[PDB]
Amino acid sequence: VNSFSGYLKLTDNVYIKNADIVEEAKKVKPTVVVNAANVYLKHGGGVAGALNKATNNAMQVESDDYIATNGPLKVGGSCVLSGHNLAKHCLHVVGPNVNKGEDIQLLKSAYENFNQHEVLLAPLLSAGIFGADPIHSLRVCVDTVRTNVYLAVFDKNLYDKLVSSFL
Ligand SMILES: Fc1ccc2c(c1)[nH]c1ncnc(N[C@@H]3CCOC3)c12
Numbered sequence: 456v457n458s459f460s461g462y463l464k465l466t467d468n469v470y471i472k473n474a475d476i477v478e479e480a481k482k483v484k485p486t487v488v489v490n491a492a493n494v495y496l497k498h499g500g501g502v503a504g505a506l507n508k509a510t511n512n513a514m515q516v517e518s519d520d521y522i523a524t525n526g527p528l529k530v531g532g533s534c535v536l537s538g539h540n541l542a543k544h545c546l547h548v549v550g551p552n553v554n555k556g557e558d559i560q561l562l563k564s565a566y567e568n569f570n571q572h573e574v575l576l577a578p579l580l581s582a583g584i585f586g587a588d589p590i591h592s593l594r595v596c597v598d599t600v601r602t603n604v605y606l607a608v609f610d611k612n613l614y615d616k617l618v619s620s621f622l
């Protein structure tokens with residue numbers, strides 16, 4: 456039993472809700488919140504901009520030190536950093552950005568990072584400003600993630616479309 460409330464169950468391990476991931480993280484304080492990161496951990500907009508803003512820029516400060524030490528992530532890769540006031544940990548995961556020409560096949564690799572954590576609160580990778588089809592992202596999530604994932608979808612119209620079209 457966990458504290459996630461109001462989710463629709465899609466499969467044995469995948470759950471979905473129309474919610475603002477920032478507000479969901481602040482309420483649940485999950486062990487892991489997933490950020491829709493880029494390789495530079497520059498949290499300017501989309502989910503990343505919103506999560507970072509909610510940490511009063513502490514996420515960005517920590518991220519800049521991480522990059523200065525380690526260099527950029529790989530597309531499809533991830534790193535674990537602090538969750539600040541939102542979660543115990545933040546798993547920064549880089550899905551391919553279609554608006555940069557990146558291979559959509561890398562979306563499966565990106566979701567594989569979730570399997571290193573038993574339970575996660577997450578957005579749909581590569582959705583929103585990353586330019587991929589969210590219906591496809593949900594399909595890859597369900598077919599790749601085996602651990603327990605709670606998906607927060609900000610847009611109500613999109614949430615209803617994802618549920619109604621789910622096979
Ligand atoms: F300021 C922002 C900007 C983007 C998001 C945000 C707050 N909170 C989010 N929570 C979950 N998923 C998100 N990204 C996808 C976009 C379409 O539906 C889901 C966002």
Ligand SMILES: [Cl-]
Pocket residue numbers: 500501502582583584585
């Ligand atoms: Cl977005």
